């Protein structure tokens, strides 16, 4: 019931998070570009991995994934702003951290709901994704001179 | 630049095309699934390649690529409808053919405009992408018992 | 952990039979789609072979004694085998695989439950991972057959 | 002297060159459900055919013979018949033509095997044997696609 | 080619039983040398599976109908299985594999002869290559056991 | 998550000392089977390092402070070390690896239990995956030693 | 677009004949330098094959009907074939390859001009890439023969 | 710069000098970001080397004679070298690489126009490809420096 | 003798075990701009430290020695001093600390070289020389990042 | 019962050992135009010859035999003759001597093929046949380099 | 053996005989440990073959004339070969490999000293690298045999 | 000293590299198809010595020559205009002369570094000398000659 619901919510949020990463990848300027620009590609690959896995779990459960930009934008809780070259490197990384914290919380909610329903395959998908996102939070926060502060 | 304008048109349309390919990938049902489902993955990778290359040619030119779903939806001439499992395999492939035919005509436009403005680097990007997309139209149309009808 | 051991051994038996059935599909397949589905069966057989080895060896690790003869496989399995027949349609063969896989998924579910109850978390995860991938196949097979997964 | 082993090897060169042309035609002119699988499958078959061609030709050279090596020689010596490319041939009909080409090659390789066996050319004999074995396995597979027994 | 088809099919059943025995050995092995012989059993199995797939699909190719159920395998195989037993020594396990391999080599020799007589040169080659490799393994296993190959 | 944090750090100390013990065995090993077990220790060491990095990083991720000095490892670990001795047999070296592994598996179970109770599901999976692998090695080592795994 | 189509088809026929000539060279080559030049013809044939595939398929893609019989290749090609002869010198062989390659290079230049005029830029690019590599081979072959490229 | 041969030869001398300058930067680099930018200079030099080989051998294919001595490179290049200095900062090193790339992109434009007017399409393509990647590097280099590409 | 070669090899065993522990600490406690490049760089260094550790200890074994092989032995014999991990240390302080360890290792390896050279143990001699070469390259690179000369 | 197959396998062991030694000499003492292609080509020939040696030797072991396994045994049993290395043998001569060795090996392999066939040893028979195939192909290519037909 | 060329040639003869001995060991081996030690002989032979090629070619490079006939090898080598014998135990086979390696290590020390005395530092390095790896093998072989390396 | 010969090697290796490029480009004659790519192999090996010896210089606290002018003023190798009408045999002879020079430079590097006790620099020269001298044998053999080091 609600496992399906949280899976679809992730499809929308992951689709918006991918667009944001792409913006950061494109509009980035400042010392650290040469390391953080390609890093955003590893992030988007990882984000797309969850996206594909979660929609197909949803298809497998007899659901209907969001599959249009209108659905993604309307249903996602993340918001987007116009690309701006003037944003600082640190600010871009902080934006990525924010997105990631949101996803880790969305994945937590996914774990709980699927746990309570006994959909253990879905539970695991959410657990694996959360683990990696949290490790990423640690490293970005470290780059930014901060504790992960989960 | 009109070259900048078309590169950005391509960013939006390729974003939408990518979304439509995902939908086709997810909602596909019928004989041929097993060959056409992972084939949508190869198309999406290729579309992603154009997306990043066209966007970064645009950045290189001093432009500012569309980088929010809002901008993609508003600027794209591609139309998205809700996902639907009861569409035929042959109708899904016809929809990909439509999208590709539009992309090939957009890339021709981009070729034209860049050729008129002496931007040969951009001219080449459009030409490589059109070539490959036109090859895919031939193959899709052959699967459908049809000539490419370019 | 008596019941976890017992369900690991059940899987050993059923996987062994599933493997045989998939091999029969592979060999006896005729019809449009052969060229895609014939090697597909090899992929499924490799994946089934991996559950078999992992489950059998978890059973050993736990102090069990896995079924290890064809006669044990055949009599302990709940899956039924019929003589190979070239005339079965592609579509019927795919449905036959779906039926086998639905059985395996339900058995892996019982494995999940039994082991969760006894607190054997390792066996739990083994069944959970196998169940995820079999269910994914069921979606794909059903989609080829023009149907919803109907799990 | 291996007169007939040499002769069947050159018959093979001619027949394999024409077979290659036919597969290329099937590859290009194919249309219908199953295109996406059978189209690249034709490249695999061509690659295999090309391997036989190069091996059988260079065994012939090795034996002191002179392989056919012009289109005119290929066409005039081959027993395979070519027709104009046509997009309105069905998939099942294209696969059926590949099967008849393959049945021919398999019968030709059986003749290569027997002739080389009788003349004591065991190397040539093994070449024809390996080629026959794979062509016959393809015939099984293609025939299966077409809902048929291999009927070797 | 009635006889070739027959011995190809006998090979399918015997290979399937050989595979199951190799799996018992893999699983139930205990004693010094486990760490080398346990993965070695995987290699033998992959090779046995290769013969199985190849001989079965030669049979189909000839117009035959491969055995394709466990019941058929057990009933048609000349190999006998017993319950797995951890108390068997490494020596005894390896000796058991040797006797399976000797049986298979002899069956492949019969395969070679019958296909030779019937003029089925492709089947003939399949049995010959398999026989070559099995015989090599017998040498090595025998050498491990301190013995001549004694073919 | 104070206790999950605590058992993660316990594991950092214990894995560090387990690592050092594996090095001793690798170096001081003598006897029949050296050539197989000497490199096998490298594979165990690599796997141990894997758990170590992952566990310490999970701890850093949770806002903890991993033990990171030989002093900390050696005082906090429950594993005891002794001077290297070439005169130990192969079989006793292997039995010492087994004791280390049984310790780690028990510790990984405590880690699973605790983390389950604080609802730290990520840390929980880490202990479960590591426990599954170590228990499998125990089976294998015991088999070499002619014994049941006896977990 | 009628002529881009005609030149792509001309190239289908000419590449088919060029391929055949390279094979003759490969087979009948004798003399010092056989050992590098014999497998070099294989590289050239693979390259001629790549153009053949790309140009026939671009033609298909534009609504054309590629030549696809040996009769069609032979009658439309401007390249002439003679019987293989082992007595031809290495250097005469390489000269014959140079003459084939110069013809192809001129054909690709006409390909380029015609496609350029009709606005078929994709076809245009295909000719230009092929012309570029064929001209580099011309340079290299001529350098072997102690000569300037002389394009 | 009279023609394609002329501008290709100019490219040969300028690329050789750009190669040397990139080497200088790689060696004398000091400051935060060394660990990224030091090996990045390798990638640039490798790419530069690529253009060098391509253009020189386009020039040889066309009947020309590439500069092939340091004297020729120094005297014909429009780039200016200075003595290596460790006290140049990372940001100044990168700005200098940008300056070299800006020069090369402009050379490549000239080569494009000249070859386009002469109808040497192959040479045209060579300049176009090189220019594309060089201009992309200026974007990235400029972004590291907090600036727009400013082509 | 080869008493002194054996002794320096074992000193390296202890110092490399401690160096390895220090690099792990830097790897984990690292915080600040540059983390993303330097954190995985610590892995590369540890891998190279462990290659040295494995080679020298086993040269020792090969020579008839008994390498140190307990955490107590490493801590008591090493001249390197360890302190508690601390996330407050800046990136540039962490790098400086790695430079100290490396300078110490390179000096030790010189000592290893001189001693093995004076003893005629040319195999052991080469091992120190190879390790010394790579460590000193790392010092140059680390110093460069810190805007300094190698100052060997 | 398999005495004749065993004897020819062992003959091959001795001959192959000596062939490997002749090829090494060719590799080492070669001088003249074409050195750069033919020098490494002798390594490929030697690896191939080593493959036949190991395979034929362990076929002999598999059949109950005792392979020759000493230089003395290889010299005494081989029918190939060795001469002192000489830098002034020309390239054409070096290649002609390889052809000589290869012609001898192909004829030895034909003998092994025949004997094993007569004894019903079909495994041994196929080993010789595959080796013969490959060596005869080498004779074609070497002769072609030399401007000659293979003259098998 | 009065110079570097003379000791290089001595190594050619001795490595040739060592190679022959290792093949005998590989072939005539029987007993527990066969499966590990039979392929290990292959690795030792590849290594010995690499010294042989490097030392012989160094000798050529120095103006020398390497032994290159079995007669030369056998008459110049100090190693003695005996007839193959299957009843030699595995430990006896490994003990013989150790004796050969001890001889080789001593030869390489002599090559090291001689080339050092002459200032042929390239030859010196070759003997030093070979010596190091042979000594490491002696350690590992002796360890299998439950012994110190005793160099 | 070691620093000094390290830098001389930077200069000479740069010029050797440029000479090898010329041989690569201007080559004509039977054997082109073998020798033209061999030049790339040599060029890569030279570039590897350049990088190693230069960074050893940097590592010892010196300042590598890093402009074409310094390369050319300091190298003892002579450069001539490219010429398509040189025989292959003549091409390979010029390469031999360059490598014989480099080999002798590396012996000087070896001798000086051993004297100075800079063992790391010593091995770098020893490794490069070994490979260059092996190339000399092979080139000479192609030329029907003994290596004559
Ligand atoms: Ca049917
Ligand atoms: Ca027991
Ligand atoms: Ca025994
Ligand atoms: Ca002992
Ligand atoms: Ca002639
Ligand atoms: Ca001569
Ligand atoms: Ca004895
Ligand atoms: Cl700008
Ligand atoms: Cl022991
Ligand atoms: Cl000639
Ligand atoms: Cl000569
Ligand atoms: Cl000792
Ligand atoms: Cl000399
Ligand atoms: Ni997907
Ligand atoms: Ni990008
Ligand atoms: Ni297993
Ligand atoms: Ni060929
Ligand atoms: Ni199969
Ligand atoms: Ni880490
Ligand atoms: Ni194609
Ligand atoms: Ni080049
Ligand atoms: Ni080790
Ligand atoms: Ni062997
Ligand atoms: Ni060699
Ligand atoms: Ni460098």
């Amino acid at each position: 019931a609600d496992s399906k619901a949280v899976l679809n919510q992730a499809v929308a949020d992951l689709s918006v998070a991918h667009s944001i990463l792409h913006q950061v990848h494109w509009y980035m300027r400042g010392r650290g570009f040469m390391i953080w620009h390609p890093k955003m590609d590893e992030y988007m690959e990882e984000i797309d991995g969850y996206l594909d896995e979660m929609s197909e779990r949803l298809i497998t459960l007899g659901g209907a994934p969001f599959s249009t930009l209108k659905e993604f934008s309307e249903n996602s809780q993340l918001k987007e702003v116009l690309g701006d070259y003037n944003v600082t490197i640190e600010e871009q990384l902080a934006r990525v951290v924010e997105v990631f914290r949101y996803l880790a919380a969305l994945f937590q909610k996914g774990f709980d709901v699927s746990d309570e329903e006994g959909d253990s395959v879905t539970n695991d998908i959410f657990n694996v994704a959360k683990a990696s996102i949290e490790k990423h939070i640690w490293m970005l926060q470290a780059e930014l001179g901060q504790a992960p502060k989960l």
Side-chain angles (χ1 to χ4, degrees), chain A residues 1-108 110-150:
Chain A
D2 287 272
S3 296
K4 286 197 274 181
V6 59
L7 286 159
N8 223 4
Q9 176 65 230
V11 163
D13 293 315
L14 289 163
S15 303
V16 175
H18 174 111
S19 179
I20 296 178
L21 287 169
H22 235 333
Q23 167 171 289
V24 167
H25 181 71
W26 291 330
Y27 282 88
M28 191 176 289
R29 262 179 210 183
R31 299 300 310 284
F33 174 89
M34 192 49 51
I35 213 66
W36 288 105
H37 169 86
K39 182 62 76 181
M40 301 296 135
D41 284 327
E42 290 177 15
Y43 292 157
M44 281 182 337
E45 212 76 84
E46 179 175 331
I47 289 312
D48 281 325
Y50 304 145
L51 188 21
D52 197 62
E53 170 162 59
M54 287 176 186
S55 60
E56 284 158 23
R57 182 63 188 164
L58 176 59
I59 300 159
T60 298
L61 291 167
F66 298 130
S67 58
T68 61
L69 304 195
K70 179 189 190 275
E71 283 171 301
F72 298 147
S73 213
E74 302 202 335
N75 288 277
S76 167
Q77 318 270 212
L78 304 157
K79 290 290 130 86
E80 302 197 274
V81 289
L82 290 184
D84 183 5
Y85 291 115
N86 297 319
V87 176
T88 78
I89 291 275
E90 275 102 356
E91 287 180 317
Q92 292 292 19
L93 296 186
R95 280 180 65 216
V96 179
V97 166
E98 280 182 331
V99 172
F100 278 14
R101 296 200 183 282
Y102 171 86
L103 291 175
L106 175 66
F107 297 161
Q108 189 55 239
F111 182 103
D112 299 338
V113 157
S114 59
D115 193 43
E116 191 38 67
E117 307 195 322
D119 176 5
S120 66
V121 171
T122 302
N123 186 251
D124 229 75
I125 299 176
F126 281 124
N127 210 205
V128 171
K130 188 194 170 268
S132 181
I133 293 298
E134 292 179 330
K135 186 178 183 199
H136 291 319
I137 297 172
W138 154 52
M139 294 191 186
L140 282 154
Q141 284 294 95
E143 177 76 26
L144 296 165
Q146 290 174 65
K149 295 194 268 175
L150 286 191

